[PDB]
Amino acid sequence: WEDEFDLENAVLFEVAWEVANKVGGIYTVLQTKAKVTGDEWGDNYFLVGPYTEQGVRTQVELLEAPTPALKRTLDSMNSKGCKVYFGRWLIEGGPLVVLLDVGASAWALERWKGELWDTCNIGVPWYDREANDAVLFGFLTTWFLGEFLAQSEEKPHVVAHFHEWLAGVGLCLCRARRLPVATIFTTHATLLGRYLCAGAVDFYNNLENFNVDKEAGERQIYHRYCMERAAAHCAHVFTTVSQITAIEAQHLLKRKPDIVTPNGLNVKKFEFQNLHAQSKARIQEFVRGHFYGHLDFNLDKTLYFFIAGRYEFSNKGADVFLEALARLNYLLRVNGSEQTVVAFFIMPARTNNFNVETLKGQAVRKQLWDTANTVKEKFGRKLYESLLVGSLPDMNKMLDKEDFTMMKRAIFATQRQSFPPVCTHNMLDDSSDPILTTIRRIGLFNSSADRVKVIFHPEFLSSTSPLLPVDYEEFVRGCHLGVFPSYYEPWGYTPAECTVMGIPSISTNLSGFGCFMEEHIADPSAYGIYILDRRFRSLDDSCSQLTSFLYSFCQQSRRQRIIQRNRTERLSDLLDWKYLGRYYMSARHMALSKAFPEHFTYEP
Amino acid sequence: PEEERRKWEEGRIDYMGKDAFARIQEKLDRFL
């Protein structure tokens, strides 16, 4: 937005446990949003966070505060028993960060807990180190905000935006001290949602039939749920990153969010067909190496699907992907479609080292490539010489005995009897792995009859990997489709990266990204986004619909695939922070309107 | 009357008992 709003003396503090502390996905959200928030708030934008030695040592450049009230606040809090650091976060925008050492202020924790009893009726056990750190951080942030307001010679308007339950106890304390502060609360994931969905008792179907206190008591996380609910209740403005998480919060936190604030990206033109061509060529080389001695299928009609992210079988919907892969294999075999589908499972697991068959295949492909280049180069040299002389070359003589010997060595190298391995690594738990168990149960063994090959790479893609020395970026640029049929995904960062990169993707309406694209696009499938109806369908129906999506993608021609990919490359403008920051702007404006109705007015 | 705060420690909390969230909301709303 380009709204005309008053922020002349207003100051914004964005409180988050992940500021200069990468312990989740909110770190990238804050890092990317810092630029667009700075371009609007100037030097009145601060990022409260926790003090970590590693984070400061690698990311924070300690500075001297720029306003006298800020020096007075830091000095008072440092001489009153705490240790507070002021610095600049070394990212785009270089936002000023107010880091707090929670451990150095632990000596008051007991007394502070008493305060939490006297205002909020919230108690925390001693053994919850994470919750006690949250309490310390919240008390430190509240004290910082109060001291900053006290030391200001002219009292400004403070907007405190707390992220997640870790930072929300500060919101509870701020609302319990009548501080002139506009408090916003953003939940990037409801706390009980992960545990309830992990129970596999139809989390989304029974959202209105849950006993939140009973479930928390079963999980022994009642204090955490209570403090997040208090943060959501007390906030002037309650926002969420998605509509599905908004429903989760309406039914679990018992408050309907005021705005939904989707996560965005710093899209930077990371065209899209040169990179796709190069990455597809490298993926083809990897597939040639892996399937050496079994390359009986056309590689010009091979489609590369992929799924990535954290290795959560049920949550990421990898079981649905595998079942749909088996059904699609049957569909391709029965219909005689000469299409081949190579499905990559890039999901890190606990692995020992690289498989012997996979390394041997890569070495065999390298040897074949070297042999082919050598023979081709000397053939071209002899051909050029013959053409210069003016004679039509005789191919029965342009190969000397050395070429035949080395080609025979290559042919003997390619000889192989076993089938290509499903997994490229040695899994420490072959029996305990859900992906391998499902693959061996459904019958996808990379045989010649199978039209669907499966490659499970249980490690992060890096350029230092001997197998496939390309990062996640460049690897998935060369894939045709990304399938993310997730069940519990509050926003979904892998599908969003995939869409920004220009690759058509399959998401669900139970993910935040899927809901976002569903509500922002008239016909998502035209643009390359396929949304599964996982919220109103049984899992068998979800697998059938995913199979239909995959078969429809396979039945597309090259022309339709290119057109769809062009539309997907168009789509990336929706996912930038330039468009998606207006939701945060609106949330801050409602917070200012609610906390200071006399000075600020908001028109929704 | 700090007996309930003793129960709040160590996770010995009766979720639907005396320390239910209704009283938490009441005390929050009173000082809001």
Residue among B4, B16, B18, B24 with most chain A CBs within 10 A, to mutate: B24
- Taking the alpha carbons at both ends of chain B, their separation in whole angstroms is 23
Taking CA atoms, A469 is separated from A44, A460, A476, A502, in Å, by 44, 11, 13, 21
With CB atoms and an 8 Å threshold, state whether A120 touches B9. Answer: no
Residue A374: what residue type? T
Residues of B in contact with A119 (CB under 8 A): 27, 31
Residue of A nearest to B6 (CA): A123
SS (H, E, C) A177-192: CCCCEEEEEEECCCHH
* A194 is an annotated ligand-binding site residue: yes
| Structure determination method | cryo-EM
CA-to-CA distance for A148 and A236, rounded, in angstroms?
20
Could you give the 3-state DSSP secondary structure of residue A109?
A: helix
- Contacts across the A-B interface (CB distance below 8 Å): 65
Return the SS3 of A505: strand
Q: Is there a binding annotation on residue A588?
A: no
- What is the torsional sign of CA A488, A492, A498, A500? positive
Rounded distance between C-alpha atoms, residue A247 and residue A231, angstroms:
17
Whether A561 has a binding-site annotation, put simply, is yes
What is the rounded distance in angstroms from the CA atom of residue A260 to the CA atom of residue A281?
41
Resolution (A): 2.8
Residue of B9, B15, B31 lying closest to A216 (CB–CB): B15
Give the closest-approach CA distance of A225 to chain B in angstroms. Answer: 10
**Beta-carbon neighbour count of residue A62 at 10 Å?**
11
Q: CB distance A122–B21 less than 8 Å?
A: no
| Burial bucket for residue A55 (CB in 10 Å: 0-12, 13-18, 19+) | buried
Query: Which residue from B minimizes the CA distance to A216?
Result: B15
User: How is residue A419 annotated by DSSP?
Assistant: P
How far lies A169's CA from each of A98, A134, A137, A162, A463, in Å?
17, 7, 8, 9, 42
Q: Which of A57, A575, A63 is nearest to A47 (CA)?
A: A63
Distance CA A63, CA A89 (A): 10
Is residue A402 within 8 Å of A382, Cβ to Cβ?
Answer: no
Q: Which of B10, B24, B31 sits opposite A226 (nearest CB)?
A: B24
Q: Is A219 annotated as a binding residue?
A: no
A214 closest CB neighbour out of B5, B15, B25: B15
**Any A CB within 8 A of B21 CB:** yes
Q: Which residue of B has its CA nearest to A218?
A: B15
Q: Beta strands A84-89 and A60-62: pairing type? A: antiparallel
